[PDB]
């Protein structure tokens, strides 16, 4: 028809449900993506030439490849093997995976970021690569990484709206659900977009405010 937002008010429980779904999806996908990513990083630092090459290729592949295709590849691609994984787990796996590569590059970058001088001071005082890393470099690379991570999570939120297409009851899916009973697409989107926005701002507020502390 023509615009009516006031009619949209009754559907709040849906949106709130959608949001809580987007949160629960991302919080878990990042959490996994992180732990996965720390692991992939360590592989690229390994002296063993094979392991570093795999982690290098793994990282190079995921980053150079669409999240969507990674989503569909797990969900649709895995069916013909008698696999029926829920939309939820597909999205988490897809995200924790896309997540993992970028987390593995943030780690590496936060280390290379600490001044090469710090290392030289440490080695030149007799400390071994091990010790230098533990007591000097790492404690300092951490302050490099946490900002880029929290900022990744913030990105993963926008990201996660794509698993809507797999029929997951996330914030983006609620527009389909709503319009089915209202024939309205516009208003439920503007609302959802506005919700994504406020989520972005807020985390960005807390992300930069936590950053100014370090």
């Amino acid at each position: 028809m023509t615009v009516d937002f006031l009619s949209m008010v009754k559907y709040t429980p849906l949106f709130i449900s959608g949001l809580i779904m987007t949160l629960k999806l991302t919080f878990l996908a990042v959490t996994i993506g992180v732990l996965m990513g720390l692991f992939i990083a360590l592989m690229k630092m390994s002296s063993i030439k094979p392991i570093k090459l795999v982690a290098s290729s793994y990282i190079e592949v995921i980053r150079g490849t669409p999240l969507l295709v990674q989503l569909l590849l797990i969900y649709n691609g895995l069916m013909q093997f008698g696999m029926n994984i829920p939309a939820f787990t597909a999205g988490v796996s897809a995200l924790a995976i896309n997540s993992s590569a970028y987390v593995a590059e943030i780690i590496r970058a936060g280390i290379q970021a600490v001044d090469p001088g710090q290392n030289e001071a440490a080695r030149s005082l007799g400390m071994t690569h091990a010790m230098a890393m533990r007591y000097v470099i790492i404690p300092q690379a951490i302050k490099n990484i946490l900002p880029a991570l929290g900022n990744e999570f913030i990105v993963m939120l926008k990201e996660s709206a794509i698993v809507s297409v797999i029929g997951f009851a996330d914030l983006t899916r609620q527009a389909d659900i709503i319009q089915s009973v209202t024939y309205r697409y516009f208003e439920p989107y503007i609302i959802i977009a506005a919700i994504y926005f406020v989520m972005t701002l807020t985390f960005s507020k807390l992300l930069s405010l936590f950053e100014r502390r370090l």
């Binding site: 710090q118 030289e120 030149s124 005082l125 007799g126 400390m127 000097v136």
Partner: protein, 240 residues
């Protein structure tokens, strides 16, 4: 003790050291000078293998350390290094800076390391600053703290790679003094510097480098008052 034997060094196409030999024995204060790009800090950094010679060999205490068959972590225990840009550890306190390496490399007693640090802090006049972080420190305070820190591992030789050049002029005397004091106490020192006063006042031997080479060397007064080489005089006229 120290013997840098005919080493060369490239950085890619860049030829920095074009065959340089340097022997320094216990007690000498050897100061290396020259124009920018002469090879000075690269030479100084071959000593404790902070750089690896493209060719040539370096022995410390009579044993080759760049044959890949030697524990370099046990070498840098003997050869100390003070950096132009201070390289203090930000997250650690003054004492914490000093006490760290001894505690973790030598496995020292924490109460003992505290007195070593407090001695050294006092020595270089940073006692009131022991629990400050390397931030509330002036650049001059920083370098003196760095010096205490290196000393706390009690090296037999100290490498000084332009310890004064990133310092405001009002800050250069105090750091140079600590350096003089160490020389006076008999510490073996190789020093790369722009401060010819130090070379004059405490240098035992002065090496003039130019274009990846030692072009001339002799005593402070030989080099500063009776220099034989033309390139030596030319450089000196611009600086003095």
């Amino acid at each position: 003790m120290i013997f840098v034997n005919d080493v060369y060094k490239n950085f890619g196409s860049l030829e920095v050291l074009k065959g340089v030999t340097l022997k320094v024995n216990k007690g000498e204060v050897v100061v290396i000078i020259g124009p920018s790009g002469s090879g000075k800090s690269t030479l100084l950094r071959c000593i404790n293998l902070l750089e690896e010679p493209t060719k040539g060999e370096v022995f410390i205490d009579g044993v080759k350390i760049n044959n890949g068959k030697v524990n370099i972590n046990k070498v840098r225990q003997k050869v100390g290094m003070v950096f132009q840009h201070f390289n203090l550890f930000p997250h650690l306190t003054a004492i914490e800076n000093i006490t760290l390496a001894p505690v973790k490399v030598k496995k020292m007693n924490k109460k003992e390391a505290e007195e070593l640090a407090v001695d050294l802090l006092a020595k270089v006049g940073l006692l009131d600053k022991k629990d400050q972080y390397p931030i509330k420190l002036s650049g001059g305070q920083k370098q003196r703290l760095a010096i205490a820190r290196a000393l706390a591992m009690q090296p037999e030789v100290m490498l000084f790679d332009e310890p004064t050049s990133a310092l405001d002029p009002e800050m250069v005397k105090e750091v140079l003094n600590v350096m003089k004091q160490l020389a006076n106490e008999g510490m073996t020192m190789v020093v790369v510097t722009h401060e010819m006063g130090f070379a004059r006042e405490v240098g035992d031997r002065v090496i003039f480098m130019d274009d990846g080479v030692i072009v001339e060397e002799g005593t402070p007064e030989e080099i500063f008052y009776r220099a034989k080489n033309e390139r030596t005089r030319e450089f000196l006229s611009k600086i003095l």
